[PDB]
Amino acid sequence: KGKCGLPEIFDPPEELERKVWELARLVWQSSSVVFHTGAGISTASGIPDFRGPHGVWTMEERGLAPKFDTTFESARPTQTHMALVQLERVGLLRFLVSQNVDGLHVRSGFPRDKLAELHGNMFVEECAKCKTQYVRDTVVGTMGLKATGRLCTVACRGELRDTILDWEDSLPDRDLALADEASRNADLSITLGTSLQIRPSGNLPLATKRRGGRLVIVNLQPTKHDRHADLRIHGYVDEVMTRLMKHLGLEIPAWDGPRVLERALPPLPRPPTPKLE
Amino acid sequence: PFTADKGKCGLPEIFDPPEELERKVWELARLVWQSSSVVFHTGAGISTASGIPDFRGPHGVWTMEERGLAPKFDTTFESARPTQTHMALVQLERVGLLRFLVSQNVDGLHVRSGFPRDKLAELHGNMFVEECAKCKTQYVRDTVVGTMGLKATGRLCTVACRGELRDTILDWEDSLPDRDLALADEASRNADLSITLGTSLQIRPSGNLPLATKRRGGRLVIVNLQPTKHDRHADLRIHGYVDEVMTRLMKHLGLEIPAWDGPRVLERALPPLPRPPTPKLE
Ligand SMILES: Nc1ncnc2c1ncn2[C@@H]1O[C@H](COP(=O)(O)OP(=O)(O)OC[C@H]2O[C@H](O)[C@H](O)[C@@H]2O)[C@@H](O)[C@H]1O
Ligand SMILES: Nc1ncnc2c1ncn2[C@@H]1O[C@H](COP(=O)(O)OP(=O)(O)OC[C@H]2O[C@H](O)[C@H](O)[C@@H]2O)[C@@H](O)[C@H]1O
Ligand SMILES: Oc1ccc(/C=C\c2cc(O)cc(O)c2)cc1
Ligand SMILES: Oc1ccc(/C=C\c2cc(O)cc(O)c2)cc1
Ligand SMILES: [Cl-]
Ligand SMILES: [Cl-]
Ligand SMILES: [Cl-]
Ligand SMILES: [Cl-]
Ligand SMILES: [Cl-]
Ligand SMILES: [Cl-]
Ligand SMILES: [Zn+2]
Ligand SMILES: [Zn+2]
């Protein structure tokens, strides 16, 4: 279960402020920006992470229990989830790679054709026969790609299965392939609340480094790949992302409740870019 | 500070099965529709879903301290967003279904949600609020006032005064603010419905205010994951996440939960907005 319960790092405010301006600078200059997210971007909605001070695995190692302040169904997308919605909407996010099974990116209204859900989604079941996916309003009741008890309704009666990978299960080929292509082709990869400890998910941001790409890591704890980052920001991702959006001249949009967007809409207008050099 | 009785910490959580939860939220809807004067009492449990830990929960400040462990914050107080529950309370006031709001929370989230300060009793103070010792003018800051226990913050009153500004955060020995307690008590006594949300009700007198509503035939509803001091006196106890309860409630009452435009201070309640017609009940 990897390195659990590592101490947190807090950049002092002055340093925190300068690094967020540097991130702004990087977003403005990059043609292709890919965001990698993990459990840390949902901690501010009451969903514990895995390896943080009170993470699932960290609490288990100490003979304690993780604490949920929400159900998966009653969780609201964080300020960070909604910033990513807007960043995609105005063309500043090329693609979004997530390790999270908590369903919050989809329910935020983030376009599924710009999202790799590497470890699956608790609300998503898949027909074994035709591979048609169903995005449900409640958590699918099983994990480990098991029979849910429901049947495909495609004009098929195929066995529906959860999309939650067990330890032995290889990542979905479609999601990993698009995630890998996005990462290789990106000139900026930004990581938000992941420790980058899982192979290959944790390694995707490193692929951006190939052919001169830039890596930014936003995380309260040290990550597996700190050494490879051009910029490491140690603070709460919500604070980092609200400062970034303010610098970029972008509103964080209202969440109208759980909404599924299959396909990315045409790009909205965005502010003009500052002079940088 | 050190010997201070911190009460019953870390009691087991109780979860109503979904059918019972759904039935009880419909009963709560029935009570709200029938009540002339509805008063909400909130504590630390309504902020857990924004990453601020409570005091007496499984992972609360005092519970964790008892076991030699630390509470965990997933936000700063300045970056915390009001929960679905905070914003539901905003709307319930706006459509005239909330008479008054009594809070033990120092986390600044009611004010910052845009809830009107003239319908809010902040019994234990507010981390973002400093007060002039000379003229009692309050200042609602964008960042936390850096001191606790009614201490000198280092800033001076700007009223057309130069009075010493002090934090509004009570220490253990400090009595409640007289204005906030007085209005909270009056609200509570005169209410025919008190709804408690995410408080264990263990603090005197804050936790006792909801019992005052029971006087002259009032009804008490307690929403809480743990047992509370006054469970025996409740007409209705709901054991679930306050966000689930309040979203289902708003749905039943035909109310949208409004957008948070970011931290906004409202000094005075605005005129009442339209609300849905009431169902036939009896
Ligand atoms: N608000 C916050 N702001 C910034 N960082 C945060 C915050 N909250 C927590 N963190 C950090 O966020 C980091 C979360 O790292 P991990 O807990 O490993 O989550 P993963 O998504 O990378 O786990 C990958 C898979 O492993 C599992 O087996 C599952 O299959 C997962 O899908 C921590 O370092 C915190 O310091
Ligand atoms: N999401 C949730 N949904 C429902 N209940 C919840 C949730 N999260 C927590 N709870 C419950 O929320 C309850 C929180 O109770 P306590 O932790 O005693 O907070 P207080 O506000 O009453 O503390 C009063 C004062 O004492 C202090 O010294 C300070 O002065 C405080 O101002 C728990 O029983 C949880 O089960
Ligand atoms: O890979 C995984 C598959 C299933 C789960 C299950 C629950 C869970 C627990 C958390 O604290 C966060 C989360 O998002 C989900 C977790 C990881
Ligand atoms: O009465 C009080 C005075 C000061 C404080 C300080 C911090 C604090 C800790 C929490 O976990 C929640 C909260 O809202 C505030 C807490 C209570
Ligand atoms: Cl526990
Ligand atoms: Cl739990
Ligand atoms: Cl759930
Ligand atoms: Cl701890
Ligand atoms: Cl803070
Ligand atoms: Cl209004
Ligand atoms: Zn099928
Ligand atoms: Zn003054």
PDB file of N, CA, C and O and ligand atoms in Angstrom, chain A residues 68 70-74 122-123 139, chain B residues 241, ligand 7:
ATOM      1  N   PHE A  68     -15.505   9.165   6.980  1.00  0.00           N
ATOM      2  CA  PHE A  68     -16.308   9.819   5.922  1.00  0.00           C
ATOM      3  C   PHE A  68     -17.227  10.862   6.556  1.00  0.00           C
ATOM      4  O   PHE A  68     -18.013  10.500   7.374  1.00  0.00           O
ATOM      5  N   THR A  70     -19.325  12.512   4.418  1.00  0.00           N
ATOM      6  CA  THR A  70     -20.362  12.464   3.353  1.00  0.00           C
ATOM      7  C   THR A  70     -20.550  11.017   2.903  1.00  0.00           C
ATOM      8  O   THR A  70     -19.615  10.233   3.092  1.00  0.00           O
ATOM      9  N   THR A  71     -21.686  10.687   2.298  1.00  0.00           N
ATOM     10  CA  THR A  71     -21.776   9.487   1.429  1.00  0.00           C
ATOM     11  C   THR A  71     -21.235   9.863   0.059  1.00  0.00           C
ATOM     12  O   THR A  71     -21.065  11.110  -0.254  1.00  0.00           O
ATOM     13  N   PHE A  72     -20.959   8.871  -0.784  1.00  0.00           N
ATOM     14  CA  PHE A  72     -20.517   9.182  -2.166  1.00  0.00           C
ATOM     15  C   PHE A  72     -21.620   9.974  -2.878  1.00  0.00           C
ATOM     16  O   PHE A  72     -21.312  10.905  -3.643  1.00  0.00           O
ATOM     17  N   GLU A  73     -22.875   9.603  -2.644  1.00  0.00           N
ATOM     18  CA  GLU A  73     -24.030  10.243  -3.331  1.00  0.00           C
ATOM     19  C   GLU A  73     -24.225  11.707  -2.906  1.00  0.00           C
ATOM     20  O   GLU A  73     -24.706  12.506  -3.749  1.00  0.00           O
ATOM     21  N   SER A  74     -23.931  12.048  -1.654  1.00  0.00           N
ATOM     22  CA  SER A  74     -24.202  13.379  -1.051  1.00  0.00           C
ATOM     23  C   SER A  74     -22.942  14.264  -1.102  1.00  0.00           C
ATOM     24  O   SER A  74     -23.066  15.412  -0.677  1.00  0.00           O
ATOM     25  N   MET A 122     -17.323   4.594  -9.067  1.00  0.00           N
ATOM     26  CA  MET A 122     -18.274   3.839  -8.204  1.00  0.00           C
ATOM     27  C   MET A 122     -19.690   3.912  -8.787  1.00  0.00           C
ATOM     28  O   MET A 122     -20.467   3.037  -8.480  1.00  0.00           O
ATOM     29  N   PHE A 123     -20.025   4.948  -9.575  1.00  0.00           N
ATOM     30  CA  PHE A 123     -21.394   5.133 -10.120  1.00  0.00           C
ATOM     31  C   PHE A 123     -21.554   4.508 -11.512  1.00  0.00           C
ATOM     32  O   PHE A 123     -22.699   4.491 -12.046  1.00  0.00           O
ATOM     33  N   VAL A 139     -24.193   4.722  -6.037  1.00  0.00           N
ATOM     34  CA  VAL A 139     -22.994   3.853  -6.220  1.00  0.00           C
ATOM     35  C   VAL A 139     -23.483   2.482  -6.684  1.00  0.00           C
ATOM     36  O   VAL A 139     -24.425   1.940  -6.102  1.00  0.00           O
TER      37      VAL A 139
ATOM     38  N   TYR B 241     -26.060  11.944   7.688  1.00  0.00           N
ATOM     39  CA  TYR B 241     -25.232  13.113   7.286  1.00  0.00           C
ATOM     40  C   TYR B 241     -26.153  14.316   7.052  1.00  0.00           C
ATOM     41  O   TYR B 241     -27.229  14.166   6.358  1.00  0.00           O
TER      42      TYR B 241
HETATM   43 CL    CL C   7     -21.686   6.280  -0.109  1.00  0.00          CL
END
